[PDB]
């Protein structure tokens, strides 16, 4: 029938009429990158490569969610609040006195199944919802709703309300943008994910850098997210997707993804990219989980993690998908605090960074170094600790 491809073009020379010429149908045109998602009869893909202004034609790959219910739970109750073990492990609670992440400029975007936006322990922190499914951007809530539970769970780990009920997130007051890039089954196309990343930048207004001041992540005038979190993976390294990642990085957004759960020598994509923080999983006894893909940047609680779940509910899940929000929360705490004290945010930084001058550099040196000294193939730099990190930030 047809297949979905993603074309990188020379925007000046590429004539879109040509794709319609070959029976192609345009799905979505990227704002931030020179690329377009198009459905073509596989008969035409060859024709596409040979067109002028077509630099590359890449295929629509797949990535998948990285968390699974620990006991095959369908979700359950917490009438009274409890603090999940990971939250303590990560030294979050001490921080709340300084900040809970409720500074206004700060948003955290989670690209995942969607969210249960009416969950009592979530709702007040849910700022914006979108779905990028099938290359259609929808802002209607019915589209936005979690049909899997993985995303609602990822989210509670980051933001869940500090209150009478349920559980509580690393950054319990931070603003959430739930960008749904995965289906009911937890499967996603690489193209929809790239669109999700773009949306996280564009923000609700649709305008990236509306002030045209060159500042986004950390500009109050702007609506951009300052932390994109992807508890998902796939094995493909595609050009266009990287490009979108660079776009986010360049906008100063901190990006975090799960290493993957295959006990692999190295992380899944996008975790594998240089500007993305790859997150490993540890357990309650501080062993690295056997499933956790190796060579992460850092690690965090990934085993038996209680969080929110749909229909106003809670559940325990496992995977590097679970580790990922913990890190994301830490960065949110860090940026929110830094921006509460000075009126800016820190640079994202690099993998080698070991200084207090970068968000990553801070994570790198405030982490609890385990196993072999220094960065290691199992723990990465170590286990992320919020309290130390913030201190480094404000120091
Ligand atoms: Ca923002
Ligand atoms: Ca709660
Ligand atoms: Ca701006
Ligand atoms: Ca501004
Ligand atoms: Ca180590």
Residues 265 and 370 in one domain: yes
Do 21 and 169 lie in one domain? The reply is no
Distance CA 296, CA 294 (A): 6
Torsion angle in degrees (nearest 10) through CA of 83, 81, 128, 362: -20
User: Helix 386-394 vs helix 359-366: angle between axes, to the nearest 10 degrees?
Assistant: 130
* 180 in the same domain as 120: yes
How far are the Cα atoms of 105, 314, 370, 371 from residue 132, in angstroms, in the given order? 24, 26, 39, 40
List the structure tokens of 289: 């989980």
Is the separation of the CB atoms in 161 and 176 below 8 Å? no
Domain co-membership, 25 together with 173: no
Any long-range contacts for 21-29 (C-beta under 8 Å, 24+ apart)? 22/47, 22/48, 24/48, 27/134, 27/135, 27/136, 28/135, 28/136, 28/137, 28/191, 28/195
Q: Report CA(334)–ligand 2 centroid distance (Å).
A: 21
Q: How far is the CA of 298 from the centre of ligand 5 (A)?
A: 10
The ligand whose atoms approach the alpha carbon of 368 most closely is: 5
E-assigned strand segments in 224-264: 227-230, 232-233, 254-258
Counting ligands in written order, the one closest to the CA of 209 is 3
Residues 55 and 166 in one domain: no
Please tell me the number of Cα atoms within 13 Å of 225 on its side-chain side. 34
What domain count does the chain have?
Answer: 2
Ligand nearest to the CA of 207: 3
Using the mean position of ligand 3's atoms as its centre, give its distance from the Cα of residue 39 in Å: 34
245: domain CATH number is 3.40.50.200
Which of these three, 42, 59, 76, is where a domain ends? 59
Nearest in space to 322 (alpha carbons), one of 259, 389, 390, 385: 259
Contact present, 75 and 315 (Cβ < 8 Å): yes
Question: Residue 386: which of 83, 89, 91, 86 has the closest Cα?
Answer: 91
18 and 46 housed in the same domain: yes
Residues near ligand 2 ion, CB 5 Å cutoff: 81, 121, 161, 163, 165-166, 168
Domain end: 13, 28, 59, which one? Answer: 59
Q: If you measure from the C-alpha of residue 66 to the centroid of ligand 4, how many angstroms do you get, rounded to a whole number?
A: 36
Ligand whose nearest atom lies closest to the CA of 82: 2
Residue 220, token pair as written in the block: 């109050």
Q: What does the alpha-carbon distance between residue 89 and residue 386 come to, in Å, rounded to a whole number?
A: 9
Tell me how far the alpha carbon of residue 160 lies from the centroid of ligand 2, in angstroms: 6
Q: For residues 181 and 266, what is the distance between their CA atoms, to the nearest angstrom?
A: 24
Do 260 and 336 belong to one domain?
Answer: yes
Contact (Cβ atoms closer than 8 angstroms) between residue 280 and residue 366: no
**Alpha-carbon dihedral angle through residues 98, 101, 103, 106, given to the nearest 10 degrees:** 140
* Nearest listed ligand to the Cα of residue 376: 5
CATH number of the domain to which 24 belongs: 3.30.70.80
Same domain, 105 and 186: yes
Q: How far is the CA of 109 from the centre of ligand 1 (A)?
A: 10
Distance (angstroms) between ligand 2 centre and the Cα of 219 equals 29
65 and 50 within one domain: no
Nearest C-alpha neighbor of 231 from the set 265, 191, 184, 281: 281
CA of 218 to the centre of ligand 4 (A): 9
Helix (H, G, I), strand (E, B) or coil at 389: helix
Residue 47: φ, ψ to 5°: -65, -40
- The residue segments making up the domain with residue 221 are 60-395
Are 283 and 296 members of one domain? yes
242 three-class SS: helix
**Number of residues in the chain:** 395
Last residue of a domain, one of 59, 84, 102: 59
Exposure of 372 by Cβ count < 10 A (0-12 exposed, 13-18 middle, 19+ buried)? exposed
Using an 8 Å Cβ cutoff, are 288 and 259 in contact? no
Ligand 5 centroid to Cα of residue 236, in Å, is 28
**Quick one: 377 and 390 in the same domain?**
yes
- Assess whether 126 and 46 both reside in one domain: no
């Amino acid at each position: 029938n047809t297949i979905r491809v993603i074309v990188s073009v020379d925007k000046a020379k590429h004539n879109p009429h040509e794709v319609l010429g070959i029976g192609g149908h345009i799905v979505y045109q990227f704002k931030l990158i020179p690329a377009v998602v198009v459905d073509v009869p596989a008969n035409a893909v060859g024709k596409l490569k040979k067109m002028p202004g077509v630099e590359k034609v890449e295929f629509d790959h797949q990535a998948v969610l990285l968390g699974k219910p620990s006991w095959l739970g369908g979700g359950s109750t917490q009438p009274a609040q409890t603090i999940p073990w990971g939250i303590e492990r990560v030294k979050a609670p001490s921080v709340w006195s300084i900040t809970d992440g409720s500074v206004s400029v700060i948003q955290v975007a989670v690209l995942d199944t969607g969210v249960d936006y009416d969950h009592p322990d979530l709702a007040a922190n849910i700022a914006w919802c979108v779905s990028t499914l099938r290359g259609k951007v929808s802002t209607k809530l019915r589209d936005c709703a979690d049909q899997n539970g993985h995303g609602t769970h990822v989210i509670g780990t980051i933001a869940a309300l500090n209150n009478d009920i349920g559980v509580v997130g690393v950054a319990p007051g931070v603003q959430i943008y739930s960008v749904r890039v995965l289906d009911a089954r937890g499967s996603g196309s690489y193209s929809d994910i790239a669109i999700g990343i773009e949306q996280a930048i564009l923000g609700p207004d649709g305008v990236a850098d509306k002030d045209g001041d060159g500042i986004i992540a950390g500009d109050p005038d702007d609506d951009a997210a300052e932390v994109i979190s992807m508890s998902l993976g796939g094995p493909a390294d595609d050009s266009y997707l990287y490009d979108m990642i660079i776009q986010a990085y360049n906008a100063g957004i901190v990006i975090v993804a799960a290493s993957g759960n295959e006990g692999a020598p190295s992380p899944s994509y996008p975790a594998a990219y240089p500007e993305v923080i790859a997150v490993g999983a540890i357990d309650s006894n501080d062993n690295i989980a056997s499933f956790s893909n190796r060579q992460p940047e850092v690690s965090a609680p990934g085993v038996d993690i209680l969080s929110t779940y749909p229909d106003d509910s809670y559940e325990t899940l496992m995977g590097t998908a679970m580790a990922t929000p913990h890190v994301s929360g830490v960065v949110a705490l860090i940026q929110a605090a830094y921006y509460q004290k000075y009126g800016k945010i820190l640079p994202v930084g690099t993998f080698d960074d070991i200084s207090k001058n970068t968000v990553r550099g801070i994570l790198h040196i405030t982490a609890d170094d385990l196993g072999p000294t220094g960065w290691d193939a199992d723990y990465g730099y170590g286990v992320v600790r919020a309290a130390l990190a913030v201190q480094a930030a404000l120091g």
